[PDB]
Amino acid sequence: GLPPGPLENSSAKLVNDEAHPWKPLRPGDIRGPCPGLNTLASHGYLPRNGVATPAQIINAVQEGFNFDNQAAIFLTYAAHLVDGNLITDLLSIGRKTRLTGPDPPPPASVGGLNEHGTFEGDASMTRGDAFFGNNHDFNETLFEQLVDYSNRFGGGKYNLTVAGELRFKRIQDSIATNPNFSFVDFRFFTAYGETTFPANLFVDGRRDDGQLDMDAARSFFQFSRMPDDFFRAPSPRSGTGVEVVVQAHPMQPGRNVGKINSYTVDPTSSDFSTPCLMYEKFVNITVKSLYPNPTVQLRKALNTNLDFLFQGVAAGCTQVFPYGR
Template sequence: MVCFTYFVTLALAYAGVVSAFPTHASLAGLSRDEVDRALASLEQATPTPPPGPLSDSGTKLVNDDLHPYIAPGENDIRGPCPALNALASHGYINRNGIANPAEIITAVMEGFNMDHGVAVYTTYAAFIVDGNLITNLLSIGEKTSLTGRSSSGTTAGGLNTHNTFEGDSSITRMDAYFGDNHNFNEKLFQEFIEYSNKYGGGKYNLSVACEFRRKRFQDSIATNPEFTIVAPRFYTAYADAVLPINLWVDGRQDDGQLDIEAARTFFEGGRFPPDFHRAARPMGANNEMVVFEAHPIEPGSNVKGVNTYTPDHSTPQKLDDLCVQYTFHVENTVRKMYPNPEGPLLESLKINLGYLFSAVKDKGCEELFPYGR
């Protein structure tokens, strides 16, 4: 009898878990049946168009009284992006770490002065693959234990999801192969300090970024049998190397020299330094080509274990061409994740792909309609 009661309780609990699809989990890669089951429990929200650029885009105090740091609580989600973690912990987005794309775009512009086009492109590119296109919510990570395993038992993943937007050879996070792709790693940060001392006179700057970017690729090639660096991670790996230089140096200082204490506050603490003023002007991945050209690498993967890095020419090596990146994202990454969308999922995909395109429209890119107009 005890056994039977236990079985029934377990079955009911399981049924509860599977019927309530997480409101912030992606529907990418699900079968038609799975999507239908998920739709039954999700409340549909209207997609949010991207907000416009800031009207006042100079430096200003952003670690202010209206946005105090509050450490994340047990149920709050944090993930691999230290900047989004900080925006959540300062209340620029919901402190629980779940937000809609428009809220994220507003927050990265307001809190860091991220360039409007970069903010819109990055947010929708990530949201379409890692967010929930029905509820219009994206989670900046997943509730995790220290080992990096999901503690909630769901697969909500959000920005932690490996090889959709998150990827290998990060600055302060380990490769997913080693078990935890999203928490700060002290050993990696010590290497970051070592390189900042050696190439930057104790600061993280463009010279350090050139050398450390190469080192992190080399480390992964030599230690991670599953190392892969193809689109979109091939592009974001270079952006991530320069964002701390462009957007984490206090706007009043504005000299491209990030001191180690501030770097630790962002990377490890997921918070703004005291009295932090955002960048002096809107910035994005400025100078990423300098980092790329210092030690160019072709997109590719370890194909047969460590030290078997083999170029993969399906990812265009076009770091400086956003139209090419947009085309690849839409025609390859997104198409593969949503091969045959229908109903509300299809409608939302079309609308959000339109918002993604709005970020590259003025670059002269051709709009793509993989699911029809």
């Protein structure tokens, strides 16, 4: 379907309401590396089995959290292009599943959001790097580090100051321990934005003060659960304040080169000075590598979802056409 538009009414309101109760997982229910989508599935803003259409995801992040429309469109269609089934229009918010339908031919993976190196990547705050065996489940040791950083830099709350320090710590931990650490292009951008999301979207909208308490943080990150009486943010937003996180410890895009402590800058990578390059490489390299020579029906679905992706791209970038117009 067409990408949903912005909310008609973006006021703060109770989103942990009678129509959207938290429920535990049933056998087969999928949760993944994103605490936002996980919480929306566990409150029935998304299908509770964790398999959704792009339009369901965009409507859920707007209605449940007041995620802004352009951000919702960009992230949802990026995820769907690399991890979703373009013919059935279904995406898993976690593991690969037969529930997204018959797979396209290799080298397309349709691996769900758990697929490493498409959307998901290294130096996550509460999830381990894929090299360590699990890129999707809540990790208590990593969450306790988030609590420690909140105690040291946030007066016991998670805020953008904490985000700036923790983002850098996770990068340094990956450089020191993950010989395959990758921090370029799409992951370089999204890794910084994601650290603002708890301060911008997990804070009760009646306060909207950017100070996330650790009880609320655990409820979202571990249990995919809104606090009792949770109000969504009082206006549409996503990554506002990402400039604070970058400014704390400015990094160049790069990777470990098959050994720990070998972080090598990639001059072919996009960085925050070249946001349009990040979009162009995502389409021309990442998407194209999954679908190098698609059949007629796949080509049509790709071009449709690429048009939708471009709706989410900041004004001033040129649309690219890997399969023609």
